[PDB]
Specification:
heterohexamer, A mainly alpha (274), B little secondary structure (6), C mainly alpha (53), D alpha/beta (215), E mainly beta (336), F mainly beta (232), A: 274 residues, mainly alpha, C: 53 residues, palmitate (chain A), membrane (chain A)
Chain lengths: 274, 6, 53, 215, 336, 232
């Protein structure tokens, strides 16, 4: 199972790398990034790429059972994984907010929707990621690369687990579900009073798309953040479900291009160019 | 954590 | 009839003019192109020193 | 570099900032191209807040600029590309013209020329079917089949008006791209402007979904 | 009634005249001349700031300042060397289809579907660009205005006419009629004594400024004409139409010399220009790019494909050091 | 245009005072503004500069910390707040215009100025001559020398010439050492290069008698010459 799961790990890593790499390639030159949407897509692609490039390390830690890369590598890889995962989840939230303030607030938002605002918000997302992930570097050493915070080790481990759970699954889901239900509402209230709307049209396409950018995100990360807690507050033996949970967590960063990428008008045109 | 309790 | 007299006058005024052969026209076109070929920056690219762009 | 070369750069940056701020204010105005064969021109009087005739009005904190190009006698092919990008096209058609003359067929021909135009692939058309009052009396006296031989329905407003509306909406060959917001013009103070605002906000919402990738 | 017969005969006579003086086939005259070769041009500068399709640009006689008009209701003056915006003139009518720069540099003009050529004064106390005049009198739309001096400008319009104005007064001092279609382009001779226009009747006309009467007519296109330029010698001009073809006409032979076309090109030419030597003919196309032609061989010599939309305007500097292209993607490019 | 100045007067040493400059007849907001100073019987010294949009402020090394230059664009006003005044601050202060774009003419208009009195690496421009007797019709050449080449790598020689007739304010004559301002005849001209600069007058005439000043705009602080008086 170790060999087959490692092969699947490599396949997923390369697929995500290809997808997000082509994303940045399309957005840098053929798209000619001007607006905030392109900045956010660029930041998300960078975050996704950085997260994805650390699969084989984990696959060797699960297969080799040791860390033959050095303590500094054990710290750095872990830190980069936390940074990329958190900033990817935050870029998703910032994209979802930028849309609510672009279809429901299309007038006053012009001041907010500027490239400078996008860049400063991106810098803030990266800074927040680093601030919330430093406790990893501060307490990461070879044991098996893991965290060995001071006693009570269990207490610090639940504190960090709940910190990440909240600040990287709940605030996003609570600000990505809301920002997408208040977007459908606007498409409904302003559809009946158009003088042409028969059976709702163009809502059947945005109500299924919107309920597909949230299910993927909330189904790739729910298993990870539930099995974690379950396991701190309960736990079990034999395991290997952790492998499934982790692969799911890394899979959300392979489908992101298929949602915020190839489905964007500029992305469609630029990909048609090549 | 990533592998596995926690 | 409304504009069938001035138009014919304009056509007549256009016709009564000397017309050189196309060979001479080509000759002076080529002569002008050759005489100014050394000072056409787009035709002959200039070094990076004498290039404000 | 030099003191005065950097004051020029600062001036250029200020000009850029003002251009940005003026482009932001222009994108919140809804440009509407006013068409119609032989002119509901004069539909334009609804709100009471040289080639093109730009009429500016306001409704619910939304600024409307209605550009009328009736005075331009030149070939439409040479200046219609200028209006590529307007929010919508308000196309007024007089219902009380089917019996006159043929004129309704001219309206249909113009609607086909404009809707299926290389420049207005995604530009929604607001079809204003006015003169319905006179249309009632006309169909009461003269059957609607005068203009539509294929018409096989009761010469009554409820049916004739709907048949004409479908005969007009069928000219659209790109129903996936654009949508025609039909409406039977009735003064009713703020009734036509209300419909124009509703259609314009729907179009704006579609465009913003397209611009955000959300659709 | 029967008077139409004579005209036909006269027409034949005219043809015979320009058929009698045709014995060269210019393409056959250059059999022994070395080709220009291959011309690769790089986008030296990119000028950004217009938020809509730009429709016209014009170079300053200093070869450093240029003016460009766009549908965002803006007339921007660029310092091409540093990409600096010198002036940003807000326009009353955003439907602008042409823009000019005075040879002195004191004034810029513009106009479009408003039927007026507004003339703006750049060098004023008060440190602002005020509109110094608004020339009305056209019943079509302004398609091209080109200054003669600070007090004289020549316009063309969609009402099938051209005009020559006086600034201090604002009256049409001359009117040039004879086109049977919209006039879409203008070009003033280097001596500014006689200009040439190209209309939608698929014909060009060589006028006279002082007299006010047409001097020659030039046919050969099978579609409407959108661009026209004069050769540097002022003895020939190039026209670009919607039939995907550029043609060169000689004012002395009263006949076309070269046709610049290729089977793999089907779009229409939007702008035309020459090089300082008149040895390269630059033509902007609807296929989103520009093409460089060997004006004496008719073979293409390069391409300037860098625009993501229709190239609408195109112009070469007076010193010849640079080319500028404007396009519907709202960017200008300085090539060299 | 008009640039009126108010606030001048008599204050005690160490006090504070505000000078106001009211602009009328030009686009104040698109104009850089300078505060120049002239001691009772000495030459000009640039005191402060605030850019258009107020996004850039410069001060002389003699006023940093205690002089603040402000700008009220909506009401077209310029302010100079002075604290801890000294006897060296007694002078007439001038409000000066400046626009900066390709081909502009900075320092094209000066105010009349306000008198302030109180009780008891920089480029150096050398204008050696301090008096020159002349007769109408004679051609005179005023000379200026700088301690550093004013020619920039962009081809501009940032030298400016001013003229101040008795009981008047300085009046720009030449900008960038060759260009002739608007409102001055072709009699005046300038030429030179790299620290060697000469003005030239042909067919001199009355109303040309005054003090001709030199200035460099190569870099801040802006420095003036000592003034070349020209009498009969």
């Amino acid at each position: 199972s170790a060999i087959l799961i490692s092969f699947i790990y490599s396949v997923v890593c390369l697929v995500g790398l290809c997808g997000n790499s082509m994303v940045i390639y399309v957005i840098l030159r053929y798209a000619k990034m001007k607006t905030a949407t392109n900045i956010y897509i660029l930041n998300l692609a960078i975050a996704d790429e950085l997260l994805m490039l650390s699969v084989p390390f984990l696959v060797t830690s699960t297969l080799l059972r040791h860390w033959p890369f050095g303590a500094l590598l054990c710290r750095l890889v872990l830190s980069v994984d936390a940074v990329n995962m958190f900033t990817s989840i935050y870029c998703l939230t910032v994209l979802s907010v930028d849309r609510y303030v672009a279809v429901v607030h299309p007038i006053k938002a012009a001041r907010y929707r500027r490239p400078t605002v996008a860049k400063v918000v991106n810098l803030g997302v990266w800074v927040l990621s680093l601030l919330v992930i430093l406790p990893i570097v501060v307490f990461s050493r070879t044991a098996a690369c893991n965290m060995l915070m001071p006693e009570p080790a269990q207490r610090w481990l639940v504190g960090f687990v709940l910190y990440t759970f909240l600040m990287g699954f709940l605030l996003p889901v609570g600000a990505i579900c809301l920002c997408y239900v208040l977007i459908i509402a606007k498409m409904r209230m302003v559809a009946l009073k158009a003088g042409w709307q028969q059976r709702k049209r163009s809502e059947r396409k945005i109500t299924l798309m919107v309920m597909m950018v949230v299910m993927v995100f909330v189904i790739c990360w729910m298993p990870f953040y539930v099995v974690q807690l379950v396991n701190v507050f309960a736990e079990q033996d034999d395991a290997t479900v952790s492998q499934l949970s982790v692969i799911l967590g890394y899979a959300n960063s392979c489908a992101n291009p298929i949602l915020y990428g190839f489905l964007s008008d500029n992305f469609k045109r630029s990909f048609q160019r090549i | 954590x990533k592998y596995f309790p926690x | 009839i409304a504009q069938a007299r001035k138009l014919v006058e304009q056509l007549k005024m256009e016709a009564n003019i000397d017309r050189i052969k196309v060979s001479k026209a080509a000759a002076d076109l080529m002569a002008y192109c050759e005489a100014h070929a050394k000072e056409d920056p787009l035709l002959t690219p200039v070094p990076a020193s004498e290039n404000p762009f | 570099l030099s003191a005065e070369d950097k004051a020029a750069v600062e001036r250029s940056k200020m000009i850029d900032r003002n251009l940005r701020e003026d482009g932001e204010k222009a994108a919140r105005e809804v440009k509407l191209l006013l068409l119609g064969a032989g002119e509901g021109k004069s539909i334009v009087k609804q709100m009471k807040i040289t080639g093109i005739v730009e009429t500016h009005f306001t409704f619910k904190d939304l600024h409307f600029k209605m550009f009328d190009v009736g005075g331009q006698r030149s070939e439409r092919k040479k200046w219609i590309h200028c209006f590529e990008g307007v929010t919508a096209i308000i196309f007024c058609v007089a219902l009380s013209d089917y019996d006159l003359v043929n004129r309704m067929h001219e309206s249909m021909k113009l609607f086909d020329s404009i809707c299926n135009n290389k420049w207005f692939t995604d530009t929604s058309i607001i079809l204003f079917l006015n003169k319905k009052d006179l249309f009632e009396e006309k169909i009461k006296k003269s059957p609607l089949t005068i203009c539509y031989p294929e018409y096989a329905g009761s010469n009554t407003y409820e049916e004739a008006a709907a048949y004409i509306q479908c005969q007009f909406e069928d000219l659209n060959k790109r129903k996936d791209t654009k949508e025609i917001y039909t409406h039977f013009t009735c003064a009713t103070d703020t009734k036509n402007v209300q419909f124009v605002f509703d259609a314009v906000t729907d179009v704006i919402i579609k465009n913003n979904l397209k611009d955000c990738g959300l659709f | 009634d029967q008077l139409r017969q004579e005209a036909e005969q006269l027409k034949n006579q005219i043809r015979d005249a320009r058929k009698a003086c045709a014995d060269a086939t210019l393409s056959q005259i250059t059999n022994n001349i070395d080709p220009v070769g291959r011309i690769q041009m790089r986008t030296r500068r990119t000028l950004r700031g217009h938020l809509a399709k730009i429709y016209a640009m014009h170079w300053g006689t200093d070869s450093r300042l240029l003016v460009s008009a766009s549908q965002d209701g803006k007339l921007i003056i660029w310092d091409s060397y540093t990409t600096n915006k010198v002036h940003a003139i807000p326009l009353r009518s955003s439907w602008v289809m042409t823009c000019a720069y005075a040879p002195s540099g004191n004034y810029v003009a513009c106009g479009g579907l408003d039927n007026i050529c507004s003339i703006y004064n750049l060098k004023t106390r008060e440190g602002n660009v005020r509109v110094s005049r608004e020339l009305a009198g056209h019943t079509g739309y302004l398609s091209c205005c080109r200054f003669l001096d600070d007090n004289q400008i020549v316009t063309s319009s969609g009402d099938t006419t051209c005009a020559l104005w006086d600034i201090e007064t604002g009256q049409q001092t001359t009117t040039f009629t004879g086109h049977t279609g919209d006039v879409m382009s203008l070009s003033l001779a280097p001596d500014t004594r006689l200009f040439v226009s190209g209309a939608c009747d698929a014909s060009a006309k060589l006028w006279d400024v002082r007299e006010g009467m047409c001097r020659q007519t030039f046919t050969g296109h099978e579609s409407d004409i959108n661009a026209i330029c004069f050769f540097p010698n002022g003895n020939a001009f190039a026209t670009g139409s919607d039939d995907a073809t550029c043609r060169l006409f000689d004012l002395r032979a009263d006949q076309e010399l070269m046709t610049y076309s290729h089977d793999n090109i089907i779009c229409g030419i939007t702008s035309v220009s020459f090089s300082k030597s008149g040895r390269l003919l630059l033509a902007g196309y609807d296929d989103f790019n520009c093409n460089v032609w060997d004006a004496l061989k008719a073979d293409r010599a390069g391409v300037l494909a860098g625009h993501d939309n229709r190239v609408s305007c195109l112009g070469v500097t007076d010193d010849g050091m640079a080319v500028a292209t404007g396009s519907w993607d709202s960017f200008l490019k300085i090539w060299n | 245009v008009q640039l009126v100045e108010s606030g001048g007067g008599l204050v005690q040493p160490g006090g504070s005072r505000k000078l106001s400059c009211s602009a009328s007849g030009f686009a104040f907001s698109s104009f850089g503004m300078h505060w120049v100073r002239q001691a009772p019987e000495k030459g000009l010294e640039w005191v402060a500069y605030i850019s258009s949009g107020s996004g850039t402020i410069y001060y002389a090394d003699t006023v940093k910390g205690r002089f603040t230059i402000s700008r009220d664009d909506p009401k077209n006003t310029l302010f100079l707040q002075m604290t801890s005044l000294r006897s060296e601050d007694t002078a007439m202060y001038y409000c000066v215009r400046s626009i900066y774009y390709y081909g502009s003419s900075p320092f094209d208009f000066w105010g009349q100025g306000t008198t302030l009195t109180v009780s008891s690496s920089d480029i150096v421009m050398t204008q050696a001559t301090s008096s020159v007797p002349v007769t109408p019709g004679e051609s005179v050449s005023i000379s200026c020398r700088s301690s550093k080449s004013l020619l920039h790598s962009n081809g501009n020689t940032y030298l400016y010439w001013f003229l101040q007739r008795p009981g008047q304010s300085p009046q720009l004559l030449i900008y960038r050492m060759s260009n002739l301002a608007s409102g001055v005849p072709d009699r005046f001209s300038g030429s030179g290069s790299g620290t060697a600069f000469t003005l030239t007058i042909s067919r001199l005439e009355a109303e040309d008698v005054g003090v001709y000043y030199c200035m460099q705009h190569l870099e801040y602080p802006l420095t003036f010459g000592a003034g070349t008086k020209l009498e009969l």
